């Protein structure tokens, strides 16, 4: 997980999959600085969290 891997600060998110107020997701990809285990790579280079397009908010959820 995040314990055996020491990565750089997360990259900025890409364009949100939903460019509208409809719930969607984003994509990111950081760089691995160091790993506590050289025999096991750190596949957590990328991540995905939900998003909402412009003119949207969490005022309803």
Residue 46, exposed/middle/buried by CB under 10 A (0-12, 13-18, 19+)? exposed
Q: Taking the CB of residue 5, how many other CB atoms lie within 10 A of it? A: 19
Experimental method: NMR
- Domain extent for 39: 1-52
Number of domains in the chain: 1
Q: HSE on the CB side for 5, CA within 13 Å?
A: 16
Is 18 contained in some domain? yes
DSSP of 18-59: -SSSS-EE--EE--EEEES-TTS---TTEE--EE--TT--ST
Torsion (CA) 6, 9, 15, 17 in degrees, nearest 10: 40
Q: Residue 43 and residue 57: Cα distance in Å, rounded?
A: 31
The residues near 12 (Cβ < 8 Å, ≥ 6 apart) are 28
Is 57 contained in some domain? no
């Amino acid at each position: 997980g995040s314990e055996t891997c020491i990565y750089s600060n997360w990259s900025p998110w890409s364009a949100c999959s939903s460019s509208t107020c409809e719930k969607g997701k984003r994509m990111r990809q950081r760089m691995l600085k160091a790993q506590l285990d050289l025999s096991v790579p750190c596949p957590d280079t990328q991540d995905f969290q939900p998003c909402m397009g412009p003119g949207c908010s969490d005022e309803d959820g």
